[PDB]
């Protein structure tokens, strides 16, 4: 019916479990994390890029004065100068010798090539986890996606899978993130409406085509000096360019746990951390009555050789006897040894070779062939290959991580160190009562 399990969150390594009911033949269970996604809820703050200053044509009045006006353009700046007497190709352009007033303006706008080279500032909330499993039971295979929250019944057809809450909540993104051309950076951008010149976000707008651009780039207008018409000015360096030069390295290369950052929507894929408490409701159709399944009269296991390598660096064989033929499941009732095969044909008497893997220097686990638990023991040597290109299939234990001989040595030493004290104690007490009874 219902089975509770705890599959490690590693994308690709299978997990084998054995579920059974009284009067029903045991059924193999296979759980795999095919792919995982970590999609956090995002809110767009503004859009920034490299500004392009616009200097409109100057306005001058021959004999008069001009008053600076107020405009809604970003970083608008206006100045008025008292005596200019400007020149162009053709000579002087006004008759007053010193009553010439010139008006200068300068605002900023989005560069024409900002539709491709532009960054987006985002704020990210709590991250949610969604995975796609490949549950296998009996002779059937199922694929499904579910949300790891503990309440969502993500089920393909009738699997009724309920993935419990993740053991540890982890999120590679800090509160504020910046996206640019598919590269995700962890940056602390200034909040909307508070722009510091010469830094990131010196110009911002709700959208690239928004008409309410706001910016603060520290535009300064200067007094003209040359005779011909001019609008001298000086400005801070483009903060977007500065940030691009000092970007650092992206989350695609900084994020931990082997996460693969990808965008549209922003998410982290195939992260490896923690455990998932799944719960499966297997339909009764898959289960088969124990009477129909063949029974094993006896079974003895012998193991050829073993190395506790990450891959399936182990071998095993067993003799068996049965009164029928069919398919039986094989399972290893240990947390430090995983078989490769789930089921295997059986024909009366014979022998089957099964490959396994372990991370302990002892193949001292229990193997069952549709029941009939059997004990194996071997002499597991360390592996030769220093480096392999495949993740470890079993988490390293401790109680099993120590060799039998070392366990024996430590046990004998501690036993002697605990026995001599007690024997001294008892002889002391017997002599003490002897002395008390002396008089």
């Amino acid at each position: 019916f219902e089975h509770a399990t705890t599959v490690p969150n590693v994308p690709g390594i299978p997990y084998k479990a054995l579920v059974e009911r009284a009067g029903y033949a045991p059924l193999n269970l296979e759980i795999t994390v095919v792919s995982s996604e970590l999609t956090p809820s995002t809110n767009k703050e503004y859009v920034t890029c490299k500004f392009h200053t616009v200097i409109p044509s100057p306005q001058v009045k021959c004999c008069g004065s001009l008053e600076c006006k107020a405009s809604s353009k970003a970083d608008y700046t206006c100045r008025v100068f008292g005596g200019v007497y400007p020149f162009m190709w053709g000579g002087a352009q006004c008759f007053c010798d010193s009553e010439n007033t010139q008006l200068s303006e300068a605002y900023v706008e989005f560069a024409p090539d900002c539709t491709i080279d532009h960054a987006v500032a985002l704020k990210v909330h709590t991250a949610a986890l969604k995975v796609g499993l490949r549950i296998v039971y009996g002779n059937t295979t199922a694929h499904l996606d579910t949300f790891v929250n503990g309440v969502t019944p993500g089920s393909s057809r009738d699997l009724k899978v309920i993935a419990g809450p993740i053991s540890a909540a982890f999120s590679p993104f800090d509160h504020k993130v910046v996206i640019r051309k598919g590269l995700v950076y962890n940056y602390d951008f200034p909040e909307y409406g508070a722009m510091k010149p010469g830094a990131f976000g010196d110009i911002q707008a709700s959208s690239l085509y928004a008409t309410d651009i706001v910016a603060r780039t520290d535009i300064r207008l200067l007094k003209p000096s040359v005779k011909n018409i001019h609008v001298p000015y000086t400005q801070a360096v483009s903060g977007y360019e500065m940030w691009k030069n000092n970007s650092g390295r992206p989350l695609q290369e900084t994020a931990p746990f082997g996460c693969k950052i990808e965008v549209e929507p922003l998410r982290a894929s195939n992260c490896a951390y923690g455990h998932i408490p799944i719960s499966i409701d297997i339909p009764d159709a898959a289960f088969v009555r124990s009477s129909e399944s063949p029974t094993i009269l006896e079974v003895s296991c012998t193991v050829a050789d073993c190395i506790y390598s990450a891959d399936f660096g182990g071998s095993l064989t067993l003799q068996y006897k049965a009164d029928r033929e069919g398919h039986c499941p094989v399972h290893s009732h240990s947390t430090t040894a995983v078989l490769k095969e789930a089921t295997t044909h059986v024909t009366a008497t014979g022998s089957i070779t099964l490959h396994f893997s372990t991370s302990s220097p002892q193949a001292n686990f229990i193997v069952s062939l549709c029941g009939k638990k059997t004990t194996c023991n071997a002499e597991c040597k360390p592996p030769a290959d220093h480096i392999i290109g495949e993740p470890h299939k079993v988490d390293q234990e401790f109680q099993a991580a120590v060799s039998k001989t070392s366990w024996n040595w430590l046990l004998a030493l501690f036993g002697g160190a605990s026995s001599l004290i007690v024997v001294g104690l008892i002889v002391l007490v017997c002599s003490s009562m002897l002395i008390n009874t002396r008089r």
């Binding site: 390295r249 290369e253 900084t254 931990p256 480096i387």
Partner: protein
């Protein structure tokens, strides 16, 4: 947007030892090499490597 063509560097040769690998890299022009552990903490590195 379109597609460009970019060079593929000479494939390195790995020398494997206990709890550590060694890369033998050759590059006529500057090339990027980044590493990151897959554990809880990621000691990301970045280096522009030129020459052998």
């Amino acid at each position: 947007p379109t597609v460009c063509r970019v060079p593929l560097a000479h494939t390195p040769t790995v020398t494997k030892w206990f709890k550590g690998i060694t890369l033998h890299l050759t590059a006529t022009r500057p090339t990027l090499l980044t590493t990151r552990k897959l554990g809880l903490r990621a000691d990301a590195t970045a280096e522009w490597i030129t020459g052998t």
